[PDB]
Amino acid sequence: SMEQVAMELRLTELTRLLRSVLDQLQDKDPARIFAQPVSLKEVPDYLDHIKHPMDFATMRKRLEAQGYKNLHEFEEDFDLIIDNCMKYNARDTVFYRAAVRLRDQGGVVLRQARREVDSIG
């Protein structure tokens, strides 16, 4: 149907905007701490601690399959990256501190993304 096409075009355009958001957030992680999944070879107990692991590569795979239907879904995954790190790692660690800085910096980006998503529809 034409309606299904129009819906698909909106999803495609959302995907464009989320790719630009994703790039901007990942620039706020210049150490590449959150770039890839935590390795279960190197952290064999991880899944005993963290039930829903997340990282920027995993988000990028979902994004490229047009797997985020709305900004809320995308933000959920970004928040997992931060929140998982802040639980597994202690306050005095480079990992935790990196997550705090990513959260603070990413907030700004996400605030305007929400306005754009609402504005353009």
Side-chain angles (χ1 to χ4, degrees), residues 83-102:
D83 292 337
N84 286 349
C85 185
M86 294 174 72
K87 293 172 190 60
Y88 191 80
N89 302 113
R91 231 165 8 256
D92 72 328
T93 63
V94 67
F95 310 106
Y96 186 110
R97 286 162 177 281
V100 168
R101 294 164 58 85
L102 177 65

Side-chain angles (χ1 to χ4, degrees), residues 2 18 29 36 73 81 83 95 97-98 103-104 118 121:
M2 197 51 224
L18 299 180
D29 172 31
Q36 296 291 332
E73 290 190 347
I81 294 177
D83 292 337
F95 310 106
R97 286 162 177 281
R103 187 199 63 183
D104 284 351
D118 294 354

